[model samples]
Target: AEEWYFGKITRRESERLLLNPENPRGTFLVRESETGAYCLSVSDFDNAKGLNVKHYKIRKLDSGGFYITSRTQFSSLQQLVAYYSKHADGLCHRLTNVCPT
Candidate 1:
């Protein structure tokens, strides 16, 4: 089981996470983008192309976050969110954490 944090695709933080495979699960606190409602999700990664890649999909619920079309389970929402905020700008362009890859 690995932990990760993710934000909106437009967010620099989000892009950094997506490019790094170390953060297998890009977990983060997000909103509808239009409604401003908070939610949580984890990003999916694919490394078949050699370089680590990522794309986020919702996983858990905080207040009004929606679930991803794919089925996924998480341990704790608080832990996931906290990890993301802490590593918001720690590293980018490389995988530093030992997450699922």
Candidate 2:
């Protein structure tokens, strides 16, 4: 599965999106995921798509606390990078955001 992003972007192109006329807020944050050390987007909605669970699958937890006991719930993004970095490329799936963080 391809990682970098929905598509690769250059520094200039990324800067333009960051300061797009539509978004005057200019809010910004940096987050690294299993794919790559990517950043956020213009709107919260746009950022939600990327920052959400694109790295691993999520499921509800019992006692109102989380699934796939077959695998571990990674503790940190660094570990995520470690896990995927060591494994072969996996299939990409679009899953419903049941419990978004």
Q: Which numbered prediction scores highest in TM-score against the true structure?
A: 1
Where is model 1 more than 4 Å wrong at Cα? Answer: 1-13, 18-48, 59-65, 70-101
Q: Per-residue CA lDDT of candidate 1, range 1-101, in tens?
A: 22332223344444454456444444333423322322433344446644433433335566443433333333554444444445543322222343232
Clashing residue pairs for model 2: 60-66, 61-66
Per-residue CA lDDT of model 2 for 1-101, tens digit only, reads 22323334444454444444343232222233223334332222345453221223323344321222344444543343344434423423222111111
TM-score list, all predictions: 0.28, 0.24
Worst ten in a row by lDDT for model 1: 90-99
**lDDT by candidate, in order shown:** 0.38, 0.33
- Give the top-scoring candidate (lDDT): 1
Supply the TM-score for candidate 2: 0.24
